[PDB]
Design a protein around this ligand. Structure first.
Ligand SMILES: OC[C@H]1O[C@H](O[C@@H]2[C@@H](O[C@@H]3[C@H](O)[C@@H](O)O[C@H](CO)[C@H]3O)O[C@H](CO)[C@@H](O)[C@@H]2O)[C@@H](O)[C@@H](O)[C@@H]1O
Ligand SMILES: [Ca+2]
Ligand SMILES: [Ca+2]
Ligand SMILES: [Ca+2]
Length: 132
């Protein structure tokens, strides 16, 4: 037994998967579901701080489970939870700007950015760690 599957990352009881391939936002949701996970939903500042660091180090644009697809300007996580006021400090200066219609969020540099959902980027899946 192992708390997390091979190649996954463990942080505070959860296992994360930083993909090595790219998909568009919608296809990233599916990829995670197939492996019993979910396109990463950030529940705490600590989590955010941990993922932001790994992502900036990866030097890769990465999708998170966040979007304003149903209602422009209103950011909602894929689990259904809404984006809280304390998390809005993480958008990159000048973001989100919806330039060209960007309804999906990604880790970019030191913060978040909204981009076209049909673009292919890397993604992070999240699921509970196994205790044993
Ligand atoms: O056409 C350029 C676009 O630039 C600004 O919009 C930003 C921009 O972000 C880029 C992008 O993430 C990548 O090139 O890395 C850069 C630095 O590492 C970063 O600045 O482009 C994306 C993609 O269109 C946008 O989502 C961002 O908001 C704005 O100036 C736009 O008005 C301008 O069209
Ligand atoms: Ca829109
Ligand atoms: Ca938008
Ligand atoms: Ca943007």
């Amino acid at each position: 037994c192992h708390p997390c599957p091979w190649e996954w990352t463990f942080f505070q009881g959860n296992c994360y998967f930083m993909s090595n391939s790219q998909r568009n936002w919608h296809d990233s949701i599916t990829a995670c579901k197939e492996v019993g996970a979910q396109l990463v939903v950030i529940k705490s500042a600590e989590e955010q701080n941990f993922l932001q660091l790994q992502s900036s180090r990866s030097n890769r644009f990465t999708w998170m489970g966040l979007s304003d697809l149903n209602q422009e300007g209103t950011w909602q996580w894929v689990d259904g939870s809404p984006l809280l006021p304390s998390f809005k400090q993480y958008w990159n200066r000048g973001e989100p700007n919806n330039v060209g219609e960007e309804d999906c969020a990604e880790f970019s540099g030191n913060g978040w950015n909204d981009d076209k959902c049909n673009l292919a980027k890397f993604w992070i899946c999240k699921k509970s760690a196994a205790s044993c």
